[PDB]
Design an enzyme around this catalytic site. Structure first.
Site, PDB file in Angstrom:
ATOM      1  N   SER A 193       0.840  -1.169   0.000  1.00 54.54           N
ATOM      2  CA  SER A 193       0.000   0.000   0.000  1.00 54.54           C
ATOM      3  C   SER A 193       0.908   1.265   0.000  1.00 54.54           C
ATOM      4  O   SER A 193       1.854   1.325  -0.815  1.00 54.54           O
ATOM      5  CB  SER A 193      -1.076  -0.147   1.112  1.00 54.54           C
ATOM      6  OG  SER A 193      -2.148   0.783   0.898  1.00 54.54           O
ATOM      7  N   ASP A 252      -7.401  -5.266  -7.267  1.00 46.81           N
ATOM      8  CA  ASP A 252      -6.993  -4.239  -6.257  1.00 46.81           C
ATOM      9  C   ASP A 252      -7.015  -2.847  -6.922  1.00 46.81           C
ATOM     10  O   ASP A 252      -6.351  -2.626  -7.974  1.00 46.81           O
ATOM     11  CB  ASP A 252      -5.599  -4.576  -5.795  1.00 46.81           C
ATOM     12  CG  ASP A 252      -5.072  -3.676  -4.685  1.00 46.81           C
ATOM     13  OD1 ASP A 252      -5.745  -2.639  -4.364  1.00 46.81           O
ATOM     14  OD2 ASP A 252      -3.948  -3.967  -4.144  1.00 46.81           O
ATOM     15  N   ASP A 305      -9.878  -6.499  -2.628  1.00 49.78           N
ATOM     16  CA  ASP A 305      -8.714  -7.200  -3.242  1.00 49.78           C
ATOM     17  C   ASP A 305      -7.383  -6.567  -2.773  1.00 49.78           C
ATOM     18  O   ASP A 305      -6.337  -7.216  -2.909  1.00 49.78           O
ATOM     19  CB  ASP A 305      -8.818  -7.254  -4.756  1.00 49.78           C
ATOM     20  CG  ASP A 305      -9.856  -8.320  -5.275  1.00 49.78           C
ATOM     21  OD1 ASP A 305     -10.452  -9.025  -4.418  1.00 49.78           O
ATOM     22  OD2 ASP A 305      -9.950  -8.340  -6.554  1.00 49.78           O
ATOM     23  N   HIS A 306      -7.388  -5.359  -2.223  1.00 48.58           N
ATOM     24  CA  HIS A 306      -6.174  -4.774  -1.642  1.00 48.58           C
ATOM     25  C   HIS A 306      -5.805  -5.396  -0.319  1.00 48.58           C
ATOM     26  O   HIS A 306      -4.615  -5.287   0.123  1.00 48.58           O
ATOM     27  CB  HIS A 306      -6.429  -3.274  -1.424  1.00 48.58           C
ATOM     28  CG  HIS A 306      -5.259  -2.438  -1.023  1.00 48.58           C
ATOM     29  ND1 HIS A 306      -4.080  -2.384  -1.808  1.00 48.58           N
ATOM     30  CD2 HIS A 306      -5.062  -1.619   0.035  1.00 48.58           C
ATOM     31  CE1 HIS A 306      -3.235  -1.557  -1.213  1.00 48.58           C
ATOM     32  NE2 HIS A 306      -3.766  -1.062  -0.095  1.00 48.58           N
TER      33      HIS A 306
END
Ligand SMILES: *[C@@H]1O[C@H](CO)[C@@H](O)[C@H](O)[C@H]1NC(C)=O
Length: 318
Positions: A193, A252, A305-306
């Site tokens: 991230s 994501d 999805d992240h």
């Protein structure tokens, strides 16, 4: 105190091929999104389905390696790890033999980072955590391009550059002290991230300041990393030759932010997880991003999805 920037390593390449927007073909072909789906910068936050030179499949050993760095990134969200400086967490068994050298939790930008060393695998590790409030981080993201000071003619997002700058001086001094003591060890940088953005800027800074690091011994792994800077910045990253594996899980959203159409561009070869059962990773074998891996599914993206990579929760210490 920081070693000085090395001129030969802070020069933008003279002439770069133009890159066409890698998301545009999908943005035109796919869609429309369902009416009720929320967006950020045009990319879905909560779509629940897929829409209606080269690519290859990663081998088992490659997927094992990507999984290991994901584990380091994931464990960094655990407060027993940063700032606790212990391997007391649920996926900490895989990293328990590593010596934790130092951790940080910075005051203004809340950058959480650690340096560790594995003597069996002869590796100095640098790990950056992402945000402690990921959904709010995504929702609140701005795009503020600013000069990337080390490399004239290049720009990066200001928030990312600020996240790194606050931890930079101390962390570089710790890393280079380890590298003086263990000169044959690999230096490996990872993050998920926001932490992947920070990890990129950290790898570039180490290359720019330490002659003894190069493509032979400085490696970068990210998961769910946003775009960090403009096409001149991405071409600069390619020019360094740093081995750079950028993993993306299915749909994501974060790898698609800020959108390419807003003037940002990724470097680093894309490793796109397409399936968990069986685990399948499609590698787009280009150093600048393409339209052939996760850019093919925009704008049908997902925050969910992240939050897990290789079945490991990423952003939540569980
Ligand atoms: C997406 O979020 C909005 C706002 O919470 C909600 O109204 C909608 O049903 C959600 N859609 C999906 C497909 O999850």
């Amino acid at each position: 105190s920081l070693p000085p920037l090395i001129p030969s390593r802070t020069s933008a390449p003279s002439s770069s091929p133009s890159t066409t927007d890698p998301e545009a073909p999908a943005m035109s072909r796919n869609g429309p999104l369902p009416s009720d789906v929320e967006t950020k910068y045009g990319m879905a936050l909560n779509a629940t389905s897929y829409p209606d030179g080269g690519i290859r499949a990663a081998t088992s050993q490659e997927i094992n390696e990507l999984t290991y760095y994901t584990t380091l990134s994931a464990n960094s969200y655990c407060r027993t790890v940063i700032p606790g400086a212990t391997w007391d967490c649920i996926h900490c068994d895989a990293t328990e033999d590593l010596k934790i050298i130092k951790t940080w939790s910075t005051l203004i930008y809340d950058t959480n980072a650690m340096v560790a060393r594995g003597d069996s695998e002869k590796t100095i590790y640098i790990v950056f955590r992402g945000s402690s409030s990921i959904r709010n981080w995504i929702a609140d993201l701005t795009f503020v391009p600013v000069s990337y000071p080390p490399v004239s003619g290049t720009k990066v997002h200001k928030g990312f550059l600020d996240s790194y700058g606050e931890v930079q001086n101390e962390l570089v001094a710790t890393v280079l002290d380890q590298f003086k003591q263990y000169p044959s060890y690999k230096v490996a940088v990872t993050g998920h991230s926001l932490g992947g953005a920070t990890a990129l800027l950290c790898a570039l800074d180490l290359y720019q300041r330490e002659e003894g690091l190069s493509s032979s011994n400085l490696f970068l792994y990210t998961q769910g990393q946003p775009r960090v800077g403009d096409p001149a910045f991405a071409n600069y990253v390619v020019s360094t030759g740093i081995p750079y594996r950028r993993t993306v899980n299915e749909r994501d959203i974060v790898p698609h932010l800020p959108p390419a159409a807003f003037g940002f561009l990724h470097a680093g070869e894309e490793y796109w997880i397409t399936d968990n059962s069986p685990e399948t990773v499609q590698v787009c074998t280009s150093d600048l991003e393409t339209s052939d891996c996760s850019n093919s599914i925009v704008p049908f993206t997902s925050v969910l999805d992240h939050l897990s990579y290789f079945g490991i929760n990423t952003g939540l210490c569980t």
